[PDB]
Structure 1
């Protein structure tokens, strides 16, 4: 301990069944499988939300989406002025709805505990010049995509940086000086040579290189893989899967979505996950090389369930999977995610953990690990009517030990599919357009058999949770069930 280092590798749109160690049959994930072998594989860990921005917001704020300022994907670039990068028209302001500036986020707690903070990849927590950019919210070294929409292109016009070390005064843009010579869409797009996932990992690894045993570090590696578009370097990883998958399918492109057309989509998606796995192997190798392995907790997870964008084929990859649904659904497949922890000599090796937990638990979990006691009394905003903190530390079960507290419920709400999810032990409610559906995850893991009619008292108990946990948010609307 003595303030352990923490790396949180949070990937983008990877399903529960997309890793080898969670049963994926078609994709090699040797480094994450070995991480699991040496660590703890969580079987009932959940995203903050079935989509990116609120799931990441839940992790950052320690709040469920009945309370969180961010409960959906909200764009601030739609009406932004245009800037030219070569012949390419680009938005002059990018990004999503900002985190509440009056509610603490995890990096700020780590800064108050004497940590240095890094974040490499997707921010998705406020647009350029907003009150919630990484510079303003406790990140010392940031490199990647401020904007989730920008992140659709793996060969973008620019990336974003805030580097204390370089004396940046705020977030800046780093132009991809080779990429902007070519179009953003069509036959010449793949002439772009500056691949963001490699560049962002290289910046993360340069940052990890600078760390030593002295000052504790907190790194958030929000790598965009395997989020669409399904375009990557045409290298030995991709070619392995072009050889393996036969026949394969293709994707015609969506210029409006910034998803380029591509061929061999099974090979592209498998390649993206094996590429990400190789990045994780490089992180773990670096910690060992620097003598930091025994004092660093590494967690790998995904922000939400599997996707069907840019040529992704979750039906194909889901052949052996147990959970129903995709990204944007409050069915188990939208919200239950891979979650692997490794901390040699602290987290018991080769374990499975069934503890029911969600991303809003990470804030109290980390606070417990770093010895930050009574974090709510310390960080709660006294100027608010009420400052919500929804998490329960799972530091005890992570460290194999006693006094592990249990949630009465987990809670999700999501505007685009108009859904509310509640999990109370074996019981799972999905509200769809205000109508409750009820499933037993012990007898019906795939949520095939709506049994609301057989359990009216359970339906009322779980609706009571919704009525108690949902507070109004003027930006993100869901239909509550009838009272």
Structure 2
């Protein structure tokens, strides 16, 4: 029997958020114990500076420019799947839970989907057998006229809406959702163990603004409300790992912990995390925006308490999971995700590139110790003056710019080992620069020459496609009348 696969994907948790990663308050004892019992990656990356594209990248093993999860409305624009998005995960894309049933896996998603809320994009049409969670974020409350409250699903149908059946108290921070998500995880593990190999995709979002926690966790953290949620998630993960040992299935269960993008610094200090020593955060292709905590745990197989400097990608979880299943990735398409099993089980290292996209633009690329920025951007001057700062307290001259800066002729290159905070660009005249420039540009142009970008899914929005009347609304008496509208170009970043 192939090993069970458990993917713990956090929302907006940064590289500096775990005790073992250097968080000063040391409030993640369970994750620290996971690290001590497994392998830790200090050089691990997501696939985009925000939620939806990274989640799509995880589930396809493919960059958002291949899987369609980007916009072309303007250059280097972050896009995702809000309630009004017309597109979503195309039928042409092959998702991990779809492929895993070739080895008899039963798959469940717990938490946030973000690959499209419309009927054709439902997770149960894309490989998952079970679902408890929302297709969208947990923002609200809405007035149900300008936009509807966001639905929570069980499998095919909604069981309620956020701020209705699923209360989130914005004054106090109280919500029971992480406890519900935990119980959904445990119930599924118990039902599947010694019956079918299982894949659990545990995509919680308590750490995404507005942040929440169950009452016993509120006010327990030295990091305010954000820390409260982290302690609750850490505790929950502890109980998940304990269940696997109690059912004597731990040694046949591979568990990976990571996050979908960097800490949301616009929400710091009370509602957002830390990116440790790294520059900026969510929305940017600086290290703080795409470098993530990443732990692997598989007792009797992954040697305990080790560290690997393998350049890792969230997309590698696709290809690695297939390898654990005894399966092969699709052969009719580019697959960016690499098989990490030699790294995980034998301590091997693979010389691979990490490409950093923002929308339609390859902003940066890392090979070995070096990173070249072909483009730089934080956010526009207009947004910055309105108080939106992606890099609070931070300013690196000619690097953190409010204009989309074209460095394609002379890439800004950093040595990440010597300069994790991207503070000191290499001299253009140096031998080290020339070597790095030729090595990285070679790999980038090979990538681009082989790339035929997918059509963008995130260009079009429609007021009428919001969650007015999700399936299951009728019986609950919760259907809302949609407004009259036409599809139109989404307005990004504003």
Task: Name the TM tier (shorter chain).
Answer: 0.7 to 0.9
Moved more, 451-460 or 361-370: 451-460
The yes-or-no answer on 1:444 pairing with 2:419 is yes
Give the drift of 1:408.
3.6
How many angstroms apart in 2 are the aligned matches of 1:56 and 1:46? Answer: 13
Deviations 1:228-284 (A, max 9, x none): 113333x3422223xx5xxxxxxxxxxxxxxxxxxxxx4101111111101101111
How many angstroms apart in 2 are the aligned matches of 1:370 and 1:408? Answer: 23
Give the drift of 1:219.
0.3
Which one of 101, 105, 112 corresponds to residue 102 of structure 2?
A: 112
- Partner-residue secondary structure (3-state), 1:298: strand
The yes-or-no answer on 1:340 pairing with 2:325 is no
- Partner-residue secondary structure (3-state), 1:213: coil
- Partner-residue secondary structure (3-state), 1:117: strand
In the other structure, the counterpart of 1:226 is: 207
Matches within 5 A, 1:328-477: 328-372=283-327, 374-377=328-331, 380=332, 387-401=333-347, 404=348, 406-415=350-359, 420-430=363-373, 431-432=375-376, 433=404, 434-435=406-407, 436-451=411-426, 453-454=428-429, 455-456=433-434, 458-459=436-437, 461-470=439-448, 471=451, 472-473=453-454, 475=456
TM-score where L is the length of structure 2: 0.75
- Partner-residue secondary structure (3-state), 1:375: coil
Structure 1 gaps, min length 5: 79-94, 164-170, 245-265, 381-386, 478-483
Give the drift of 1:40.
0.8
In the other structure, the counterpart of 1:98 is: 88
Report if the CA contact (8 A) 1:330-1:419 is conserved: no
- Partner-residue secondary structure (3-state), 1:438: strand
How many angstroms apart in 2 are the aligned matches of 1:411 and 1:182? Answer: 38
Matches within 5 A, 1:16-35: 16-35=15-34
Report if the CA contact (8 A) 2:133-2:152 is conserved: yes
Report if the CA contact (8 A) 2:6-2:255 is conserved: yes
Deviations 1:406-462 (A, max 9, x none): 24411121139x661201111101222332321111221211112262325633543
Report if the CA contact (8 A) 1:161-1:174 is conserved: yes
Which one of 102, 123, 126 corresponds to residue 134 of structure 1?
A: 123
Deviations 1:72-120 (A, max 9, x none): 5334533xxxxxxxxxxxxxxxx68412211211111111210000110
Report if the CA contact (8 A) 2:175-2:213 is conserved: no
Give the drift of 1:299.
1.0
- Partner-residue secondary structure (3-state), 1:423: strand
How many angstroms apart in 2 are the aligned matches of 1:447 and 1:128? Answer: 40
In the other structure, the counterpart of 1:180 is: 164
Structure 2 gaps, min length 5: 71-77, 142-147, 377-403, 460-494
The yes-or-no answer on 1:238 pairing with 2:227 is no
TM-score where L is the length of structure 1: 0.77
Give the drift of 1:362.
1.6
How many angstroms apart in 2 are the aligned matches of 1:76 and 1:232? Answer: 23
Report if the CA contact (8 A) 2:174-2:218 is conserved: no
Deviations 1:2-42 (A, max 9, x none): 30001001010111111001010125101100111111111
The yes-or-no answer on 1:11 pairing with 2:7 is no
How many angstroms apart in 1 are the aligned matches of 2:273 and 2:2? Answer: 44
Give the drift of 1:309.
4.0
Q: How many residues align?
A: 408
How many angstroms apart in 2 are the aligned matches of 1:61 and 1:391? Answer: 9
In the other structure, the counterpart of 2:237 is: 280
- Partner-residue secondary structure (3-state), 1:67: helix
How many angstroms apart in 2 are the aligned matches of 1:159 and 1:443? Answer: 47
Report if the CA contact (8 A) 2:320-2:338 is conserved: yes
How many angstroms apart in 2 are the aligned matches of 1:299 and 1:456? Answer: 37
Give the drift of 1:353.
1.1
Give the drift of 1:359.
1.3
Which one of 158, 175, 193 corresponds to residue 212 of structure 1?
A: 193
How many angstroms apart in 1 are the aligned matches of 2:172 and 2:306? Answer: 45
Aligned CA RMSD, in angstroms, stands at: 2.9
Give the drift of 1:57.
1.1
Deviations 1:310-343 (A, max 9, x none): 454599956xx32222011211111111111111
- Partner-residue secondary structure (3-state), 1:399: helix
In the other structure, the counterpart of 2:226 is: 269
In the other structure, the counterpart of 1:161 is: 153
